[PDB]
Amino acid sequence: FIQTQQLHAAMADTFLEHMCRLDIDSAPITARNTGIICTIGPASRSVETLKEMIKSGMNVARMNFSHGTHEYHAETIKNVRTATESFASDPILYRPVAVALDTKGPEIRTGLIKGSGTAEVELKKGATLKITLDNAYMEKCDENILWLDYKNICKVVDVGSKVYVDDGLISLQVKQKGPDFLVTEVENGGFLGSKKGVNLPGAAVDLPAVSEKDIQDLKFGVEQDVDMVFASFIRKAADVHEVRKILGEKGKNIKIISKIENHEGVRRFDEILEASDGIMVARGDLGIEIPAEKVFLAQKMIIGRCNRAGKPVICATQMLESMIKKPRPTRAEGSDVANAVLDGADCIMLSGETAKGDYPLEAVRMQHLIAREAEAAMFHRKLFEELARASSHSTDLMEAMAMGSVEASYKCLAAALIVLTESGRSAHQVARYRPRAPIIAVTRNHQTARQAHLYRGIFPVVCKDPVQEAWAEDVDLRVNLAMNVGKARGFFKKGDVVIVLTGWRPGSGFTNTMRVVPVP
Amino acid sequence: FIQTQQLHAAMADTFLEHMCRLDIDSAPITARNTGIICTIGPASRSVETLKEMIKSGMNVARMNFSHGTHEYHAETIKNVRTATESFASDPILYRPVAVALDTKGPEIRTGLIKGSGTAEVELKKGATLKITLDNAYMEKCDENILWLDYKNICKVVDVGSKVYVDDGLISLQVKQKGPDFLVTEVENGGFLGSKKGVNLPGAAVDLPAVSEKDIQDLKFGVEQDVDMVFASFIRKAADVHEVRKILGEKGKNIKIISKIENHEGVRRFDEILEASDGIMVARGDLGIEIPAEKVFLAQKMIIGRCNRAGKPVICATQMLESMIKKPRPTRAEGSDVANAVLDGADCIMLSGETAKGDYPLEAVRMQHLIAREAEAAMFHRKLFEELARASSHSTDLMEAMAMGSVEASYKCLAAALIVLTESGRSAHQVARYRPRAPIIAVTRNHQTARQAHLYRGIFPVVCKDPVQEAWAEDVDLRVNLAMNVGKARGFFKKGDVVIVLTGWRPGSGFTNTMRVVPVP
Amino acid sequence: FIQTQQLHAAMADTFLEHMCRLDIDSAPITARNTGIICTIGPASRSVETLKEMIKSGMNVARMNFSHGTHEYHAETIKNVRTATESFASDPILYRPVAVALDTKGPEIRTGLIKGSGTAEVELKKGATLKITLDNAYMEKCDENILWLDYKNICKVVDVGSKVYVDDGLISLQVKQKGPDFLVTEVENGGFLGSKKGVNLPGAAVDLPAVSEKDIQDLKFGVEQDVDMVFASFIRKAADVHEVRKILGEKGKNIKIISKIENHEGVRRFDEILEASDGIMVARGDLGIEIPAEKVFLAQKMIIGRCNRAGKPVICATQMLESMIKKPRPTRAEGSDVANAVLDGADCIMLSGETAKGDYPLEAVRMQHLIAREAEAAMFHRKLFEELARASSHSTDLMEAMAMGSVEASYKCLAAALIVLTESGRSAHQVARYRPRAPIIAVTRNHQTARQAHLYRGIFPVVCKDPVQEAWAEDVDLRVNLAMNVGKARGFFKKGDVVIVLTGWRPGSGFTNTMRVVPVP
Ligand SMILES: [Mg+2]
Ligand SMILES: [Mg+2]
Ligand SMILES: [Mg+2]
Ligand code: NA
Ligand code: NA
Ligand code: NA
């Protein structure tokens, strides 16, 4: 008899002994708690494919507005919703699917090489290269002078600073500083193209929070009723407030996930986290700005502080990169996904793997499989104690209900926690203290359900029955709905035990009532 | 502002830092969780005095059947019930009081010195002394031949074994065994009187679990409707079973507290504990049997394992000895009481301090003051974690409800936990996990209320209202009773938060429903 | 086979499990680490008795200057040294004995009742009592007017303040305050005699750190070559500095132990600890000033903070009080001693038990027996981690060696740590991290050897051999001397393993060299 769910490891006294007890023959559970975010694109925007994306485990469809027109993304969103609603007939097996808009964000771009968009020049290691803001050169870039569109650049870099060009492919060092130019030396050379991205490592870039294009896209996202916004290049709390402003009163319920992308974002993370609804570790752009070997420090730091605050955190970028061209991932990639879940990430993301690669369904299925194994391999008892330690300054009543309920699910090895919530707040607090059992959240709020995918372990279930007049009956209706969903999904069966959280009265502001109930 | 309840020490990371934070200016709360057991005797058996004992804090009246006739104890028991019911006119300020019978137990006795009950002889260190079982000498004891009444004594001692006479004052070493005699050498000499008690350190004494007198006294105990029995000289599980048997069906609900008094009882504690409803550390006799400098080891081992199992443990003997003749205790005694509570004892006991001393009320009031202080000074967070770890093999549902409730009570600093229970089981499990806030247990079972004092922190409240047809109205009735009691007794005021444990339906076997609820 | 030295409990994961593993059949080691401080008086001041005192365990002879002339105390001190040196014949078994001077300190006293020393009045509760500083009534005290000798009293008390008279027997409450009188109401009444001590609970009393008598006695102590002073009624760092100043240049090596005796001493303990060489928890006076049920809080706080700092701490007063008249202690007293050793007290003390009681030597022997048992029942692994955690602000090199040495002694179950030291500092740093094995400190400084008894576990050994020319030979000589002492006293035998701390070169300044060495 080998226990399931890495429960032998769970009983260890030390982290070391916990690790020593990880058992490849210990079966995980059916429920998968880590949300999977999929970037949609040419390889996956067909209604036929999106249906398989959902059945393969996609939870959130990410629209990258770095490219594509409003008409292009509108059609993808429609297909996503068409695919999503194709399962609506059976509300027991219906998976809510959320829509996320990833903004282009502010950028620094170079000019044209010899008036051409495809021309290139070779920069040689050690050579000289003057960066200019004189627009007489914006379409006349060459190996000796390079124009770019960030006019305050000289105000935020210093002599000795570095300028990266084209996703870090080329690095320049600022030797001299002038009124509207910089004289730099070519550290790493290579081929310089046209309208390439520029990164300024260490600089406090004073670009605005949103570009003029972001404002249009954000308004588009309001029109299209997106569930969340992945805001790019967030460097300070003010940037978040500005995105909140643009979304305004009509988008006040769309969640703002700040993408941490450069040094300042990491350094000012605490205030960014406080202002945001969630966080994305944008490891791709972060690894261009900061040294690559330091990215794991930022990831673990950010996930830890997000878990501490109970705010959703996303791990993104190149998690299964090799699966763009291959149907099986490398060992480093399976490691990276598992350690992302062990770190504490609420969601893991796929970008090129699902937007353009040849095996989008295999990438989704792999992440699903790894996450379930990593979820059981967590050291829940230690994790719970340390989260409770971190938040002990708070005497919040809902936190108390969450902690007691998660504590109870540990003790009796409950099969799930059923939480009735309209806003989702009660379910969020339960997910914050990291039960191993899945949280079945019943809501009559369709958006609450879609946004639930940002929190680890929340399985949203939409109740479409009218509110019963007798509160007790209305509670039991929704509880039995969760009971049926759980049985159908294979989360538990008759005779199992679940933790049920509800409101005592219709007027209760949170789930102030907890019950241990057998599954009927 | 200086925090109350040693709550600054409560937030410490380590046991050392918790101790360093103990603050004499941090006032304890009103509620006192530790049960005070008072031996009733000439100094305290009057109705007038028994009333002041209840007001001072007595929770259990102990009748010591080492002396006294059934008539004497019957009247003592009557005066206790008379004094107790004198407050029954106010079901809100009524304090239940338990009745305990402490059996005399089996004994080893010597004979008469030179035919007189008052004669004596001097045993000299190194001299020879023959112990005989020949009844020809049972009234011819002298400094050469000593008769005693335990006839299997030769079957349980060896050459080299020690024999103790007169509560350890005299000790002998076996030098020769015979068929019905022992040749001994005097180790500790002294003056030997008649009919002194004998102790066999290290021996498995095959004396019956109960004496003829004990069987009579247990019969009397059932007739008198006693709540519990303190069973003397328990050496093995079989002994506990014989007491159980003797009590039979008629006494099946009387709690059996095994007194650990000698080496074997300590060595076989686990089986004894499993068979018993509770334990008493009978330090007095234990220190006669084993070296007095080791008693604290057994006391701490026994309390710890009782805490582990959730079974009541009583610390007894000389806790406030000097107050038999003085109105204030020594510093060793004040510290002994506080350390007994820090150890985890459910109840502390008074023997001569209340049975015959000059200041029985001051003794009770001193244990009351010390316990409250020591209770605040516990390290609840670590205690809870370690109790959870010790019982994590169990998945019992009531344990899950209790652990989640205590956990919740810690998070939101609940002023109390309210438990609705008829048998008391649900409340016993809350107490087992040692919250700092008091446990207000509402029961319609008077016996359940009296026996609740065996468990740390359970304030029993007898509901005398009639059951209501509507389960919700009956629950709400008893919950409001606990509210009114707590407000009248100063445990909490309007606006404070409490944890409320109830059965979801009339047929629920335990308190499967937990709520966080503000005090109205 | 049962493990020794509670080594099974030592392998526990939690304090609960450690507590559950304490085993009365696990034999302790021969060496006793806790120092025994004996108050010498009429019962114990003869050379013959002092010889027995030493043989039974006395490490420090305490002279209470509360009473007695310089001539009387000088003769007692002389007898201590005569008895101590009667064993000097054998330098392998010789045991240094320290001499401590405990000052009388400042006092507040009342006048005579009705012009008599032997005459009393009854203060009925609720009556009125006027305190006056008018010397007219200094010999005319009665149940209406009460004189005392503290002229500034009105400046340190308020309306509502309390005044205690005759060691807390009588409690007054200041209801009206004049410029040289106080109108009080009697709270606790009693018979008031003449020239009784007064205590001002909670007051910032401004009596001098030392009295005129204290100054003469401290000077006497310097002439008498005492090893340490017990300074009474220490309320603030400045008081310590005054005592230090009085001892002056010639007494700069005499260690100052501050006696904490009232509220201000506990609240300002930190600045007192920083300025003191050591601390005494003077529980008797402390429980007169502060409510007796709080004393254990102050004891455990003070001991924890002294351990944290590595400074000696003494637990004093009424540990075996009943043994003044009885040859065996109570269970509360045995427990009090054990728990003081478990708290972490470097030394435990006897006062009247040895100074005037009927059983001085039985008292010493009982403390010796208890300490060894309690020393084994410590949770060394947890204690070491927490001490290391508390002191991590220090990167001291000798501290590093000490921790490394204790760690090593735990790992290989070393039978002893051998430390070569002239000042004792290296041995002190080892002692503060609490090895379970004894510390044999070899010193050529006789005063170092005597003062070493202040630190848990330091067995001092005076080297009397001249200094060898070859440093390596002089080291080998002293190490071997330690080996023979350890073997002679039964600390270890050939083939056991010990940790040896030495100086690499004669001027290293501390033990910078650690070796694991088998006993030859
Ligand atoms: Mg970017
Ligand atoms: Mg007995
Ligand atoms: Mg004093
Ligand atoms: Na909610
Ligand atoms: Na129950
Ligand atoms: Na040294």
Author numbering:
A (entry chain D), B (entry chain C), C (entry chain A): 11 to 530
Sentences from the paper on this structure:
PYK catalyzes the last step in glycolysis and is present in all domains of life. Many PYK isozymes are homotetramers (left); a few PYK isozymes are homodimers. In most isozymes, each monomer comprises three domains (center). The PYK ‘A’ domain is a TIM barrel, the sequence of which is interrupted by the ‘B’ domain.
With our rM1PYK analysis, we also include three new rM1PYK structures that have not previously been published: the novel liganded states are (i) a 2.4-Å structure of the M1–PYK–Mg2+–Na+ complex, (ii) a 2.3-Å structure of the M1–PYK–Mg2+–pyruvate–K+ complex and (iii) a 2.2-Å structure in which the various subunit active sites are populated by either a phosphonate analogue of PEP or succinate in both the presence and absence of adenosine diphosphate (ADP). Next, we summarize a comparison of 61 subunits from eleven rM1PYK structures, which were determined under a variety of liganded states and solution conditions and can be compared to the H/DX-MS data. Side chains and backbones that showed >3.3 Å shifts were noted; the majority of the observed changes were >10 Å. Our rationale was that the differences among structures reflect the minimal structural ensemble, which in turn gives information about dynamics of this protein structure. The B domain is highly flexible and adopts many conformations in the various known crystal structures.
